[PDB]
């Protein structure tokens, strides 16, 4: 599923991401934009052989099991394929764990490079939330 910008903000709100660990909804929308372009099916291989999965590009190196990332952890206790569902619950639950782990949203390289410090409110501008 390819979300619309306000559709995704509403889904993230509904699953309690809005202001989670102090990050406004627009941070999370912006991160999704630049990670996945709002596409729940997005997958990208990393140079280290890990893969990033879903709307938030959660990495098999630490967070989900894909059975092909040697030496990796599965700290969200889920198959990476659960992170590609049209329903964002699993991605949200896992993102909550990631963002709680000490480095906040900087874990998302696209957030750090393209969202951090910008007018992230623009991302939920005009949305009926
Ligand atoms: Cl915001
Ligand atoms: Cl593995
Ligand atoms: Cl959803
Ligand atoms: Cl923080
Ligand atoms: Na893994
Ligand atoms: Pt939820």
From Swiss-Prot:
Substrate binds at residue 101. In the egg white and polymorphonuclear leukocytes. It is found in: Secreted. Coiled coil: none annotated. It catalyses: Hydrolysis of (1->4)-beta-linkages between N-acetylmuramic acid and N-acetyl-D-glucosamine residues in a peptidoglycan and between N-acetyl-D-glucosamine residues in chitodextrins. Its EC number is 3.2.1.17. Its main location: secreted. Belongs to the glycosyl hydrolase 22 family. Lysozymes have primarily a bacteriolytic function; those in tissues and body fluids are associated with the monocyte-macrophage system and enhance the activity of immunoagents. Has bacteriolytic activity against M.luteus. PANTHER family: LYSOZYME C. This is Lysozyme C. The gene is LYZ.
